[PDB]
A paper describes a structure:
In plants, guanosine deaminase (GSDA) catalyzes the deamination of guanosine for nitrogen recycling and re-utilization. The other involves the hydrolysis of Gua to guanine (G), followed by its deamination to xanthine under the action of guanine deaminase (GDA). Both deaminases are zinc-dependent enzymes, which rely on a catalytic water molecule to attack the amino group-connecting C2 atom to proceed with the catalysis. The zinc ions are tightly bound to the active site, coordinated by the completely conserved residues His80, Cys113, Cys110, and the key water molecule. AtGSDA catalysis needs two key sub-processes: the activation of water and re-capping of the active site, which proceed via the two critical residues Glu82 and Tyr185, respectively.
Despite its reported strict specificity toward Gua only, we managed to identify that 2′-O-methylguanosine (2′-O-mG) and N2-methylguanosine (N2-mG) could be employed as reasonable substrates of AtGSDA by testing a series of Gua derivatives, but the structural basis is unclear. In addition, Glu82 acts as the general base to extract a proton from the catalytic water molecule, preparing the latter for the nucleophilic attack. In contrast, E82Q did not produce any products when incubated with 2′-O-mG or N2-mG under similar assay conditions. We found that while WT and Y185F/E showed similar binding affinities toward the ligands, the Y185K and E82Q mutants showed differentially reduced affinities.
Residue numbers in the entry:
A (entry chain D), B (entry chain A): 29 to 185
The structure:
Amino acid sequence: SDHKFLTQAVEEAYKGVDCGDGGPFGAVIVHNNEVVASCHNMVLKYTDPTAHAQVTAIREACKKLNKIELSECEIYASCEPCPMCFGAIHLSRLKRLVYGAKAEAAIAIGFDDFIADALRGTGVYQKSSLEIKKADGNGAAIAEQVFQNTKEKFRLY
Amino acid sequence: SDHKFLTQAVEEAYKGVDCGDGGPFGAVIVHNNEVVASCHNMVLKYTDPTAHAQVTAIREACKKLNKIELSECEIYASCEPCPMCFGAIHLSRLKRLVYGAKAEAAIAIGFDDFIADALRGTGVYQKSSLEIKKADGNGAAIAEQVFQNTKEKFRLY
Ligand SMILES: [Zn+2]
Ligand SMILES: [Zn+2]
């Protein structure tokens, strides 16, 4: 079931970048094989620098379920969550995080080297207990190629 | 000018708790001695675990200035920003952060031990360039007293 929801996140990223909502990032929040929220980066549409794919998905899932905690749901991120999105994932009480592409795949096309210490385990004050899975195989390949595909769809300006 | 805007952030914290919007946290975003945003925690009001005081202040400052970067403004936080809010402050490019109370003052009344390595200078992956000032003297007294005065007035989240 992981592959289906991670691919849906990659499809959210492509749709969002295509319609100009924001960067090529998508996220899907799943409650026990049922999709609760499916969104992409909305920074340019919302004029909100905090409207990343993960944060947007969390806001919409929490509105739909009338709760501020998602301890029964899991989040699928087309790309490794930034420090802000990882913090938001912690606060949301989400029980599991699956992500497809390493932050370096996004850095390769000009994004900030803005990596979450708590996700990679390099923190002194911030420790994460959350279950984290880096996608492998085909899911990782699909997520990983998103950034070169969108840089070359937009290369000729 | 720091004490005046920090005091306004503390006032926002008290407002939000009194009207039930959220926890005792407030934030003020200032552009060149003029207030662009003044907000408090809206987690309970919005059913949104990302609606901290800093995040809310940022979205509203970006709506008022209709831009997704705040490199000319500064933020005053009644309490030390968590990893999510500090990440949002990084992404917003805010140039200065003044905060009143250490996170431990909020932890003492039941909040998560949720501390931002990049703020305290222990981050490896997350590099912060903005100037950060922890308030002392009366600013610290006011910000710390927020938590003993609001004890058992609000719902913990
Ligand atoms: Zn992010
Ligand atoms: Zn916060």
